[model samples]
Target: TKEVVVNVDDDGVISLNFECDKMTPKSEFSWSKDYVSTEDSPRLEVESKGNKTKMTFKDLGMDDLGIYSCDVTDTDGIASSYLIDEEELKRLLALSHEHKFPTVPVKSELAVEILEKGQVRFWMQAEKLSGNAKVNYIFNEKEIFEGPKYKMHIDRNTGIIEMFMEKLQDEDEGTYTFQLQDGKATNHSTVVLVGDVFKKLQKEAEFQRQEWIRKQGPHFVEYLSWEVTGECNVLLKCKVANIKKETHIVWYKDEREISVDEKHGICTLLITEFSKKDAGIYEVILKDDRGKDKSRLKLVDEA
Candidate 1:
């Protein structure tokens, strides 16, 4: 039997495929060994529950890095298994420890509008880039659309690479990446997907804010946290001086209630895998029982 490899997305959705020594029928696809007992207790735990299993780790620290294993059984009573180490798992874990952004390009939304000619308008970020940038039109990497469609005059520009497609077609539906040549090296701007610009912008802005909060540290007023991961090992602290121990503190994200504390003037808000929905102006309003107000909390990040 071999181990099943799991792929985790940014949202923490986990996926994996099963492989065995023999052509195991789908009916016999199940975890033969539902449990792994390890002396490295807090580092890992794998428990099988029926057809599904749950894996949890303590601290979820960086040390929990390696090939995870589990047993698999086939219908013929013969069993073998395997799971390849996906590049994304390696890359994400590596990036997590380094506190660096993903090597992949950063996608963003500028402004998207549909024109009378059925052409699509998009304004995107590329302000940090200069000339020597090459924009290629491609559909699924086939490069079917020819020409340097990155015309700054008519196309959109967010200071990075400005692009515009004059005529809309079914082939223009996917995303296009801009390769900014820098000497012998090339930097890529975020892949610009060709639809629903407003929604894209909203998502992008929310992610940007969460990133900002992550980098800003505990000094921030109203704070939230991502689910416990190595990259999200953060805590928020609040300090109010010269107040009684019974003052209530209110925490809000865009005026939404998060937490309330009647005594000690403390409140907390936590966001799991902070998404675009959480990326809005956040505020912390500190109020006391006699309808007295003392402080205000607010923050802004673009989505």
Candidate 2:
């Protein structure tokens, strides 16, 4: 006898089925529960037509739990089974739910790549790619395209994305990100490339920040984060220091300016029922006549 591969409906009904030769007077059906013959009962249902037969149990209780077996004297005595226990039921339930797989392009860190000299390469891989997948190599924040100075190659079969650089300069030492778009799922990896000789690159970056801070005065973003509020809904919020009445705060998704409701000091942008069309790089820029500062975040849809 097989452990019945059964499924439970929403209303507490359990169902299973088997196929046998069409029932006839010459052919007979037999069933038993807990090794005892069971007669017709209100909650017991057995149906057969055109060799397709089904059994169902309703109004169930703990006392009803037992080994259920059946047979057909016709061409198919063919089947015998029993109910599944709670653990097995739960296992099957979980199996029917949504699951996660590594996207052809999938994640990590403040990943630092040490460049010995010119001709640097950035290599990354995901699980693997199918026909509908694509990869974009981004420099700083903008998507990088193929050119003489930069070469980008994607191996869809292997999930390996490579970026080649002819030469590196002080300005070239920045964050490079590779983004893979596979259907609704998006994945990316960010790497900070730095040269061993241009040790002042980091120092110069800090210097530029210090210069901008004083030049822009106090109008600047202090912090920001993405907060999930509900299904397909989220809030991208930021806190600004010295946010004044004349301090013009605006939001941009990718390059497009987005007009939404406003708030002071803390800027909270709401996205409800956010679809893939709304997915892109989100940025908030606070600027007045003189002081100006900006911050960026990416909104992706994994629906």
Candidate 3:
């Protein structure tokens, strides 16, 4: 897409210049299109260079993507082609049930940076691919463990593909290949995460255990909390109570009872439109089979 732009004068006038064929001095030129009939309009100018000609357009904007033609008699005529970006290619591919076009070229490169012991850092890229794909970490499709011992993680949004090695052992040393898949074609890379250093690196990993605590306070029943973004619809996991199985539970919003039905012994609530006003400590009333019970449900948000 070739477009020539000129500044409009304060008095509402624009000027443009172009080169023309020297052999045909005072040569005539025409610019036009079948749909846009500015064929004979005096909106263009021609100028002469060494032995070639140039045409220009003034005050151009939306007309940029349109075709431009330069014609001079007694010389060979030339035609140029202009195409939109790859967006249309993808749209047409989707319409044709083709998730990924093999013809579409892709460029991939891998980078690895070791973090803490038994942990790794890396970034992967591959074009012409789609869907949730697999990323292997071993050569010849062999497992890092005998069976399903290692877990592979891939976060497309963050471009993270890694293998979480459970226990750093000396035998885990080897060259691991990075593979990219679109649920079909797979691309491989020589870059690998070698575990040869595990024998010495294992000492760098810190191990610690979480502390246990006493029974929660009266308002601590709602200790499990959650907050959702606008794009992510509000959906909270039903907080479970570990009291006696014979106890009856009722969930409430504000001071009123939420319309939660009982199937076996569990209750759930689904809020349609979530907002700040609708968020607060929801009460879950618990009562024993003997008719004795306690009250108070507390829910908190990221204030």
Candidate 1 segments whose C-alpha is farther than 4 A from its true place: 1-3, 12-40, 45-50, 54-67, 72-92, 95-303
- Report the lDDT tens digits of candidate 1 across residue range 1-303: 444555454533343444544443453343322233343465545555345455544333445444444444544554333332455456645544433333323356344555433344454554343354455434456653435653443222434444455544444556654444433434454355556854554455455555454333322333333233445532234544334455456666566777776643234455555445555545554444433333343433353
* Ordered list by TM-score, greatest first: 2, 3, 1
lDDT tens readout by residue for model 3, 178-248: 76665544566655445545434444432311001112211124433445645644644334444555555
TM-score, cand. 3 vs. native: 0.28
lDDT of 2 by residue, 1-303 (tens): 333456655444556666554566666556678767766766678776665556776545555667777777755446576765666555544543322323343422223332433235568767767788887778778877888778877788777677766445557766788777786567677766556534554444445555655455545445568877878688887766765677667788879888744454667889887778878888887666667777888777873
TM-score for all predictions?
Answer: 0.24, 0.36, 0.28
> Ten-residue segment with the worst summed lDDT in candidate 3?
208-217
The lDDT values for all models are 0.46, 0.65, 0.47
Poorly placed runs, candidate 2 (over 4 Å): 1-17, 21-102, 105-117, 139-142, 167-176, 181-187, 190-303
Q: Count of backbone clashes for each model? A: 14, 0, 9
Top candidate by TM-score: 2
TM-score (C-alpha, index-matched) for candidate 1: 0.24
